[PDB]
């Protein structure tokens, strides 16, 4: 459950991401695939080589999906229902992998936005990604 201060922190920190959204999403994905290679079994149809345009395009989709989740942070189940269909109903992604990608996103943000990655913002972002992860792994329709 996010507090109002959590939502403020996420909106301010993610707001600073800006046009680098795809770049950070692609780098978080690259970090996941190298650090946790089992996560690669969900993308056998992807070229996962370094600098792949396909990972870059996906990373933007993920980053843009997170932007949509910030935009609809107070009613994420309805806004992300299509992604819940995909991740929970279709791909059946094990929830542990959401912790891995979430951790890699926090690592990417800490590396690129050091002035904004305060402990409080870190806490709020971790909760936000945990909330997104629950929506994407829950079957609610």
């Amino acid at each position: 459950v996010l507090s109002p201060a959590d939502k403020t922190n996420v909106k301010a920190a993610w707001g600073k991401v800006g046009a680098h959204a795809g770049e950070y999403g692609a780098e978080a994905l690259e970090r996941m695939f190298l650090s946790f290679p089992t996560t690669k079994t969900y993308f056998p149809h992807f070229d996962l080589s370094h600098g792949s345009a396909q990972v870059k395009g996906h990373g933007k989709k993920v980053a843009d999906a997170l932007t949509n989740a910030v935009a609809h942070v107070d009613d994420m189940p309805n806004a992300l229902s299509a992604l819940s269909d995909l991740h929970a109903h279709k791909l059946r992604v094990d929830p542990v992998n959401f912790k891995l990608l979430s951790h890699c996103l926090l690592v990417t943000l800490a590396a690129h936005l050091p002035a904004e990655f305060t402990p409080a913002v870190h806490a709020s972002l971790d909760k936000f990604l945990a909330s997104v992860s629950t929506v994407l792994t829950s079957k609610y329709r």
Partner: protein, 144 residues
């Protein structure tokens, strides 16, 4: 567990650049802020009621240096992490009853802190190597 020699060099080169008086305290402080139930294990540390209170707490900074020293010990004994941490495993599991998931959290908070201090130098290959280190430490600390 199994780090390639290139990973060992990359890990060791970056670790030698770590500020040993700040990084440990920043890792422990972030654990207490991001995962607030961990504060229950540190009731004798005083004020932990705000993030600035935690990050500025001198006992958090002091204890954080010791945690960082234990990671330094693990780095020089990657072959026998179970033996290096056997005594710390007894403390955390039989005396403190810390659930081992919290070991995994602290290792991942440390990785975030290393990314925070080193920025673009904390490349995905370098992170992958450190995830092997913190995983091995978390597993050794939970060995019982």
């Amino acid at each position: 567990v199994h780090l390639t020699p290139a990973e060992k060099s990359a890990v060791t080169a970056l670790w030698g650049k770590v500020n040993v008086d700040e990084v440990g305290g920043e890792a422990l402080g972030r654990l207490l802020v991001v995962y607030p139930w961990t504060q229950r294990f540190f009731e004798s540390f005083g004020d932990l009621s705000t993030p600035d209170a935690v990050m500025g707490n001198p006992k958090v900074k002091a204890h954080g240096k010791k945690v960082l020293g234990a990671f330094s010990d693990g780095l020089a004994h990657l072959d026998n992490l179970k033996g290096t941490f056997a005594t710390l495993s007894e403390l955390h599991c039989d005396k403190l009853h810390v659930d081992p998931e919290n070991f995994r959290l602290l290792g991942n908070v440390l990785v975030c802190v290393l990314a925070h201090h080193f920025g673009k130098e904390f490349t995905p290959p370098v992170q992958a190597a450190y995830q092997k280190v913190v995983a091995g430490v978390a597993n050794a600390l939970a060995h019982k």
